[PDB]
Structures are given as C-alpha cells and as structure tokens.
Paper text:
eIF2B is an ~500 kDa decamer, assembled from two sets of five subunits (Kashiwagi et al., 2016). Engagement of unphosphorylated eIF2 in this catalytically productive conformation depends on binding of the NTD of the eIF2 α-subunit (eIF2α-NTD) in a pocket between the β- and δ-subunits of eIF2B, ~100 Å from the catalytic site (Kashiwagi et al., 2019; Kenner et al., 2019). When eIF2 is phosphorylated, the phosphorylated eIF2α-NTD (P-eIF2α-NTD) engages eIF2B at an alternative site, between the α- and δ-subunits of eIF2B (Adomavicius et al., 2019; Gordiyenko et al., 2019; Kashiwagi et al., 2019; Kenner et al., 2019): a catalytically nonproductive binding mode that inhibits eIF2B’s nucleotide exchange activity (Kashiwagi et al., 2019).
The overall binding modes of eIF2(αP) in these structures are similar to those previously observed (Adomavicius et al., 2019; Gordiyenko et al., 2019; Kashiwagi et al., 2019; Kenner et al., 2019), and the subunits’ conformation in the αPγ complex are almost identical to those in previous structures (Kashiwagi et al., 2019), but with improved resolution. When the apo eIF2B and αPγ complex structures are compared, the binding of eIF2(αP) is associated with an en bloc rearrangement of the βδγε tetrameric unit of eIF2B.
Residue numbers in the entry:
A (entry chain C): 8 to 98, 126 to 351
B (entry chain F): 1 to 11, 28 to 134, 155 to 238, 258 to 295, 342 to 444
C (entry chain I): 41 to 467
D (entry chain G): 166 to 518
Amino acid sequence: GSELSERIESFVETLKRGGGPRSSEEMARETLGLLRQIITDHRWSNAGELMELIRREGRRMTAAQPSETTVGNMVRRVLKIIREEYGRLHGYAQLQSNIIEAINELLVELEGTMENIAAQALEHIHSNEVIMTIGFSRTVEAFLKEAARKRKFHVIVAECAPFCQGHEMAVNLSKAGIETTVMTDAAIFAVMSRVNKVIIGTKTILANGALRAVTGTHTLALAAKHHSTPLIVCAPMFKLSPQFPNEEDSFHKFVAPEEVLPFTEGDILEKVSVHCPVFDYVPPELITLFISNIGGNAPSYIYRLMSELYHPDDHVL
Amino acid sequence: MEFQAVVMAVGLPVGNKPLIWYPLNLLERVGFEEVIVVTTRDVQKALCAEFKMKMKPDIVCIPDDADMGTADSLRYIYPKLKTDVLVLSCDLITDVALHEVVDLFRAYDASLAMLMRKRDFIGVDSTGKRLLFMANEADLDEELVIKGSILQKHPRIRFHTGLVDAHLYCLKKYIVDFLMENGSITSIRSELIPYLVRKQFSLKSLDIYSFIKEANTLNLAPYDACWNACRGDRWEDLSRSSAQIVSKHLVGVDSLIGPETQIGEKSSIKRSVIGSSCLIKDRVTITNCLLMNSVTVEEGSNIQGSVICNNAVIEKGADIKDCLIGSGQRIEAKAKRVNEVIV
Amino acid sequence: PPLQAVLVADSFDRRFFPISKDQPRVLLPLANVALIDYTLEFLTATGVQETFVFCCWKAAQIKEHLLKSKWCRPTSLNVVRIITSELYRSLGDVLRDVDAKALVRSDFLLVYGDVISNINITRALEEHRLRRKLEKNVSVMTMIFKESSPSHPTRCHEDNVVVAVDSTTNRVLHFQKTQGLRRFAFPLSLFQGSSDGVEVRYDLLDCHISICSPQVAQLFTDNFDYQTRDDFVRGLLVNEEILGNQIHMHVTAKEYGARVSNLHMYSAVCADVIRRWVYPLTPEANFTDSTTQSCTHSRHNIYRGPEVSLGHGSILEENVLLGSGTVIGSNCFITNSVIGPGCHIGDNVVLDQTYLWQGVRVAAGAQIHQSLLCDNAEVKERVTLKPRSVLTSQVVVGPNITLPEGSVISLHPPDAEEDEDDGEFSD
Amino acid sequence: QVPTRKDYGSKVSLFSHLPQYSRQNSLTQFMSIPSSVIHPAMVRLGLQYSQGLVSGSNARCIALLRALQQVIQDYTTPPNEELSRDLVNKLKPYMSFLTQCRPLSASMHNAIKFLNKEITSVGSSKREEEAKSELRAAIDRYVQEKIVLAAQAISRFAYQKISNGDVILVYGCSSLVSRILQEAWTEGRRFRVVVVDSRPWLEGRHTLRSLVHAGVPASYLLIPAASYVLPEVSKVLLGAHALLANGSVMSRVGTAQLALVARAHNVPVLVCCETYKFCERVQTDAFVSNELDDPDDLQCKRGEHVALANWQNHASLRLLNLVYDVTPPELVDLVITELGMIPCSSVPVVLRV
C-alpha cells in the first residue's frame, strides 16, 4: 500500500514547486484520482476513520501550497460525499462501492464543465461588441472561441505584466480568426470606456463571493465598477473553496521576484526589496455574473452552493 | 552643412571603369559638392589632369610633397578644414549606403565612426555599436590586454578578427585639432584611432562607433580581387560591353569593355574584364583575367589569371599563363608559367 | 539513464574559521535550515535521485544531522551515501575516488557543498547530452552559469570570474578569476583556433554547478596533479594541443545559483533568500517537513515562526525571519534580521542587518549592526558591534562595552581576535 | 522632400486614425547626408529622437531648445528677407520633420508655439546677429525660468507636505518627482518610497536608480500589482507629461489607473507639474491624442516563447501602445504647481491667465 504513498509524494512535490499541472481542471482530475486511490487502497473500522485520514491528507495538501486551494475543496467535497453516505445508509461496509460511484459521478460531471459553459456563451455576447479579458484562462478561450462560430466581435486581452500570460490567448484567438487585440495592463482604464462586459478568468471563489484572481484583476474590476459595465466570471463551480478572505494573508503566491526586476541590474539590489504577487483580491461587491455550470449567478448566490457543496463543519479542515 | 568630403587618397582609376574616381562618384550621389582630393606630387603633376579627364563638375585637386602619411597629410590640409571632416581612403569600391554610419554618428554625438566589412583583431560591444578595442598581432605578440575598467563598465564584449574595414572615418573638428597639435601621430588607421580608443577611459567623454558590413570592401595589393567588383560592377552600373564595338561571337562571360576598342575576329573572354582602345583583334582566346590598353594582342592568348597592362605586346605565336605584363615587354611569343611572374 | 550527482560537503575554502570549530561548515544555519538542505532540495528540483554526498572533516556531525534529512526519509526520492572518508582534503581525490569505485554510471552533475539554487538543469542537461552523444565524447564538461552584473553584492571583494567563450557552440575558451587585475591577458590562441567570433564575459556568476561526465573522473585520475575544479579547467584549457576535448559553457537567465564561500557571501545570500529571490525555496514553504520550521509568512516580507510573542511596539520593517521560540520586549527595532530559535531579546534594541542564530540572547538597549552570532552567543546591555563582527560558541560580552569592527571572538585565543570571555578583553 | 513613414500595420478599428510608427524606418535612410534643406542640428535631434534616446518630456524640451539655439545661431536670413517670416518658414519643415520622426508632446508643443510667437515678435529693425543673440538669451531665460527654476520652486512648496513616517508611491521617469523626492530627502525627511512601473518601456528603473543611489529606501512593483501596495501608501505621487484644459491630467499609460485604484483605496492623490507643459486642447475622452509608438517592441520574453512571433502573419491580432491615459479631474485632489498647492479642478483658471 506504499505505492499510494509514493503517488502522494509525486503529486505533493509536483505541486510544491511551480506550474503543475499547468491546467487547473487537470489538477482537479489528478486530485480526484489520488483521492480515489486513498479510498480503494485503504479500509476503515467506521467511516469516521476515513474522514480523519482524508482530512489529514488534505491538510498536508492545502498547507503545502495554500495559493492553489482547488484540491482543498476537492478533498472538501469528498468529505461531503462520505458524510452524505454514512448519513443516508446508516441513518456499513458495502457502501465503499457507494463512495466510488459518487467520485465517478463527480468526476464525470467535471469532464463536462468546459463544454457546459460553452452553451451559455452563444447567448450573452451579441456580435460586433467589445469584450475585455485578463489572462489565458482556459475556460475563457473555450467561452469565446465557442461563441465565435455564429457571430463575430472584438476581444481585447490585457497582459499580466509579470508574464506573457495574457498573450497566449491572443495568439489562440488569432488561430481562431476573431480579430482580437493585445494591450499593456496599465492601459485598461485607458480603454475601459469602450468595453462592454469584461470577461475575466478566476482562480478561486471564496465563500464571500470574493474571487481571488490572477493579478492585474483588481484594477480591471475596479475600472468596471467605475464604468459600471458588468463582470463575467468564467468560474466552473469546482473552483470554489469555503475560505473567507481574512486569515493570516497567506493570500498571494509570491513568485520569484526575478520577474519584475530581473537580476541583471547591478548593485541597486542591495537596499531595494521587491514584491510580485501573481494573485490579487477582488471585492465581491463588484461581481455581477458567475457564469457557471448551472447558468447565471450573482455574488450572494455563491454561498448557497457553499451551503450545499462542502459541509460547513470542515473549513478548518 | 556640417561636413567636407575630404578624401585621403594618394595614387589609375584603371579598368573599363573610373575606379579611383568612384569614392568621389558615390559621395557625390549623396550631396557633398565639395570633394578635397589630394593628388600625387612626388615627381610631377601626374594626377590632376587625370581628373580633368573625368565627368564630375565639382572636384578639387590638391598637390603634395615627397611622403604624406594619412594623419600627416591631415595636418597638412588642416587649415582649409573648417567643419566636421569626412575623411576617406583611396579604394572605396563599396555600395554601402553611407547614411547608416553617419546615421549612428549624428545620433550619438560620436567623436568618431568607421566601417568594417567582413591582422587587426578588434573588440566590439554587445550592441555592436560602441566598439571597445582594436589592435593587430603586430602591435603586441599574443596578450589581448583589455583594461579591467571597461569590462567593469561595459559588461559583455564580442570579438572580430573577420573584418575588412574601409578606412572611412566621420570625424569631429576638435579631434582634427587634437591631432594637429599631436605632431608625432603619423597615420590615422595605424595609430590615431587606437590611441583615441585607448583614451576612451581615463556626458562629455568621447565616443567610438564602429559598424559591421557585408556588402563590399576596399581594394589592396591583389587588385584582381576587385575582379569580383568587375563581375559585380555592371550592377552598380544599373543606372550609374556596357558600350563598345562588340562581337557577340567571342566568349562574353561577365565582361567589360569601353567604346572605341579592340574589335576584330576570333577572340574570347571567360569570367573577367578587359581594357579599352587597345590592339586585340587577331585569332585569340579567353584569358580569364583583366588587361590594360596598349598591349598588342594576337595568336590565341591561352593565358589565365594575370594582367596585361600597358607596356606590353604579343603577336603571331603568343601564349601565356598567369604572367603579368608590367614594363619592358616588347614581346610576340613567350609561353609563360602560372606561377608568380610580371613580365 | 538515472541522474547521479557527486557532492562534497567540505568546501576547501576553509574560511569559516573560527566558526568551523563547533559545527562544520556545510551544516551552517543560513535561514534556520541547513545549506546542504537547500542543495538537496535543488538536486530534487532538477530531478536527480542518486546523490553521493561527501564529507571528510567533521563527517560525524554531518551524518548526525542528516540522518533526519528531508531526503533521509524512507519515502525520499534521493538516496544518499555519506562515505565517511577522511583522507582527501582536495576534491581531486574524491573525483578520482568516484573513479575508484565506478559510482557514477555516466553523465553526472557534480556540485560543491552549499550552492543556493533553484535551477532546472534539464535544459542544460539535455543540451550537454546532445553535443556529447550527437558528438560522441568530444565534450568532457559543459559549465553552467548565471548572468549577473558585476556591481551586485553577489561578487564580494574576494571572488569574481571572467571568461572567454565561443559564441557558436558556446564552448569555453579560457577561465580566470580577477583578484585585482586592472587589465587582463587573452592569447590569440583564441582566434588562431577559429576566425568566427569570440566572446568575453564578466557577467557570469561563480555558479559552481558544473555539469560533467565520469570521463572527468578519468581526466582527474590520469593526471594526479589537480586539486580543484579551476585546476581542472585551466589545465584542460592549456592542454588543448592534444586531448583537451574542451568545456561547453552555457549561461542561464532567470535563476540564482551561488556557491556561498565567505561570510560576506553568506550575508548576501541569506538576505537575498529571505527576499524570496530563489522561490520555490523559502522557509514558509517549509520544504523540509522538519517540524519547527513552520514559518507563517506575513505582511511585507515579515516572516514569523510560530509563537514569537513579538514585543509591544516592536517595529519590524522587512525581511525578518523570526524563528521559533523567540521572544521580544518593547520597542525592539529589528530589520533584515534572521532571528533563529531560542532568542530572548530586551528593549530599545536595534539589530539592523544582523544574523542571530539558535541559543542567542541579548539584554535591553543593546544596539547591534551587520552582526552575526551563534549558539548561546550572548551580549548584554548597551553593547555595540560593527561589520562582520562575528561571535560564536557561546561567547559573552559584558555591559557598557562597545566593540570594534572585526571583533571575531571565540573559544580560542590563538585564532580569534579575542577568546572566550565574559567581558571584552581578558580571555 | 520628406515622406511620411508607414503607419505600422493596422491599429484597433477605433484607433485607425492616430499614427503607429516604428524605428527601423529611420527617415534618414533616404535623405541627403550633408543636411542641405534639413537643418543639421535639427536632423541630429530628430534622429536621436525617434530611435528613443530622449524620453523625459522635460528633457525632450531641453534637447529641442538646445538644438534650436544652435539652429538660430547658425541661421542666416536671405538677402534682405525679414527674419520673423523666413526663419519660421524654414522652421515649419523642421517641426514637420520632428513630428514625422516622433509625435510632438504638449511640452514641445508649447515650446515651439512660444518660439513662433517670439520670433514673430522682435521688430523688423533687427540687427541680424543682435537679433539672434537676444533670441539665444531669451531662450535660455525661458528654460531657466520655467524648467530650471521651477523645479526649485515646486520642491520648496512640496517639502512642507511630506511628513516623516509616510511612504510614497511613484510612477516613472518623471524628472520632477525624482527631484522633489531627492531634495525633500536631503532636507532631512525620513520615509520609505515605493515605485510602480508599467511594461513595455519599463521605466520606473530611472527613478529607482536616481533614488537608491541617493539614499532613500525604495521598493519596486509593477502596476498590475498596484492593488497590493495601497493599504500601506500614505500618498501616491505622479508625474504629469502634459496638462490639459478641462481640469484633467494626462500622463503615461500607467497613471489614471493608479489614481483610480487609489481613490478606491482612499489615499490622497498628489501630482506635480510645471506650467509651460500645459497644453490648451481639451480631452475627457481617451483616444483623441495618444500617439502609438512602435508596438513591435511589446513582444515578451519567456522560455523561448515570443508569444507574438509575428505581429503580422496573425491577421486576427493587433497591437497598440497607448502612451497616455488621462486622469479625470475628480480623482487627483492636489496638483502642486510653481504657483501653489492648488486643487485639480481649478487648474484652468490659474493657467488661463
């Protein structure tokens, strides 16, 4: 049963350094897989022992890299599943089978997420209109080049100044022939007048409806609230996590300060500290629409799902 | 204006084409009415009338003395130089659009400039504009000494031994003066420029701004090299053989010839150029080489890679091989050897 | 094939004297963690898994601490073999030794003791592979290096590097240090070798992450005269007439690998790793699961171990790895510090730029600067210090006593510029 | 004559009218080297100008004015042809050249407009060299008055504001802010500083140097991280590369965004500017005057990923580099100027006189 432990390591490591896997929903999938293995390579006197074990493991997971809590909420929902099963079917052993199907169920639903969102797109964006996006958020490449087969419009993609992370989407939408444009984040307020409804990615959905986003997003949402054009969060619901913003501000992945001011610059690096947060906050009171697996949703709406998805008694995990 | 097309040229524009005149010609194409053209007066006036033999309405002739080194003649002509000079060497045969080097100069207030097409290893900058060193193996035996200062300031240096510069130096009046007091500095190319680069380091400092080139060069002791030029020359002659009494039967292979020239029968020419108004009309063949006029030619010149200059003759039994025609050749038949020979 | 990495945990720049008395050089706590750890996390990051460490002087303490390594767990990916040999004191012998037991299969990555790095060798590793087996052993070594600028505090007064290299295959052409050379010396050997461009650089770090190849163990055995890597590279660069098979240099652009050598280098690298310059590696990631290195990263680069009981009104502007177990009083104005575990502090104290460690202690009103301490190093009221003012091995200073710059006091008269005391003078 | 360099590719559909230039089309690639119709000092200026060797708007003024000093002092009038007319007539192609190598900023605009006004001013009883000498003197009077003494006055006003204990945000190569900070530090104040820069012409460096090499503790971060720092900053502090008519304030791409995030974090927005930069056209819009410099420079550097391998072959992809945004009046509460610590919306009055 140590092969389980070695796969656990393999992940925990690939997690604990940097981009891996470079896709988010992928991370979710490998997560669920490893969880399934934890179950199918273990037994329990009572399901409480399995709850305990998966809680320990999820603690290691989220504590390792609290910047990406996706897997945090995956183990949360798995705790929900076992909670629900021991609730129903004892309110004893064969229910292991039960558990497994749930995973598959969850799993298979996950496999449709992207395409689900696709169906919404063809509704919102009426043609020849201007949409703004910050990043290469796969869900949004899906969104747009899946609503660019019946209409035509204009998407301007900003650029997270740390990376070129807001250029790959430009080259992709070029490969999809939509006549999109590139720009430098500092100029978003420059053109925020001529936007219609910003379509932004997201990286988590706190239980306050406050999304932690790829950096250079707080300014986008603030410019939006100013011009009062609406915010289109392309957040599949698995990206939730029942964190409520204020704890300890282990909050923004502080990536290699090499990014902003590269090391080539002489001695000035002796009294010049550096900051480079790749993930910023956006207050929920600016959100408009949680385009999601179940269609339109508003800020408050989100805790409803946090009511149902993750059993509240385990946000301390 | 801010310049003077002063041309440090001594010692003739041979071929079917006024070669030596061409630095002039080309700078004339881009403004630069004034052209100071120092002449050769080590014996007599054998150079100015040769310029009266040309077609540029604005040229100037400057006599000289026994020996005139580059910086020496610089100091010599120094008084009449009342701007930022633009010196230039003899054999500029090079289609470089000079706007690039003066571009760089006029940009970064450069105390100098020069060109380098592709002895004399140099150190050029990362960006390839502010060079940082020049020398040759003659200067010093082996040690590429570079004073740690510049590597402590200019961080990354590329090198170049694969260069053919063209002795073309946009200057600044005060450097001409700095030379004028430096009586001992004899020659720009050998001593001046490396001295200046040496004094680049002990914004009111000095500048040096080289340039890499891949288009054409400056001719030297092998002038058959500019047969390359010849092959290419007609392209330069797009709107600036070409005109002669042609045969259209004899071998024409990248040939050149002036009008009123050797038009006869039974000749040939293979991948080279010719002279103008000479005696080559009898049963002849190619020579894969170039000739100057006044060399009577006849009887199947089975030669290759040589020169038939003035003071030469051949007739009715002739055959050669890579044996140049210098002075003292009243010949009609001399079977030559392809090795080094100038008869 | 697997990727095996020779490694020696005794860098023979034996400069951390007298500090080398108590605990050996490599084991040093830089940010409350073993440097050798940093190195091992590196090795794991580039993905090497059979690492052969080596320590001759003080191997005992090395094994003592490394038995509980991040990679001495059975679950580890790295296997380690502390071959406790105390014969060599120059790397030459250990390289001929990895020859002497055929340890390195092929294509290894030797590494000095305490390189701080985050570098992914795989780009290099593979290009080395390419021009070594699409070129069939014409290589022997493919130096890796990291672009920088000379003025940075990475190149202390002691050590820089300047190197001639080619630009086509990026092969080394000459390597040499510059300890006070207002000029330099390069032979035309460079150009009589080739007429297609040569480059000189002074903007590469002393990365000391030489990729190599067991035929390097050859080149060391076949000639018993090399004692350091520089010996190797200059010997091979002069012996190019025959059987050179030169070095294929290569520089990176985005990473940070420094073979910390001297106390100034330790200073620079510690107060740059606190600034996350190497991230992934920084103690709030607690990469060694070792318990007490739970570091609760917080506002404005202030790190904070658990239970620090930080003192009222004690401002801390930036880069302060307050370790575990600490405790602090009123107004203690710390800055750029590294406060290890077991560190009681007084009041009104300033500790700019200091590097405390475990066991250390200090009373009220005791200004310090540019400092350094060690186990149970103690300074009482209103003492003061200056640059590089080391003091280790539980040394004490009495009240009222200022101290001059190089005040390296320790447990020995003859080597330290003082001796174990509880005043200032009088050993 | 002087052709107009190609408007590089196509722009945003909306941006089709403003120009988009480059740097490889170095306009001197075609002219006559001995600068015959084009003025020598002028072409030197324009050439070192287009390729991007003069950036700071105030520095760009200083440069232009030095070059025109040279032009004037070398100028000659035709046979008994009146200076004020014929000079300006030579000047028009020269200013057209300066434009067709790089769009003209409001600072240079007010400068050249003043110079036309003043050349047209001096009477037709002009002893030639006397006229030119008086013009050199007046030009240097202008520069010393409005940009060499101004900086001093602005500092004298500002220093009394910046307290001790209070960090301050900065943005970009603005000479004036570097000067303010340096000075009011030298007069003994004690405060951290944080700089924010905006890609592509990453420029905060300039001030970062001129600060850390002057003693003041700094801290760097890019503008897509600005939302992070504001819970600490007690004063933003922004340059102003031009000042418009309707109270607004133009600046580099990354200014109004700073101001906005600031207002939303409730932190008092200063700005610093000197009079003569102030233009007179009006804009609360965004695309009325924002030159589009060579967008090709924008292409990033990662891995081997030049994610813009071709700006061109990807006909579905278009670039832009908006040089300026325009902070609306309401945001930036205090606009220090050499006349006082006026509030922003009242800037047209004390500048219309």
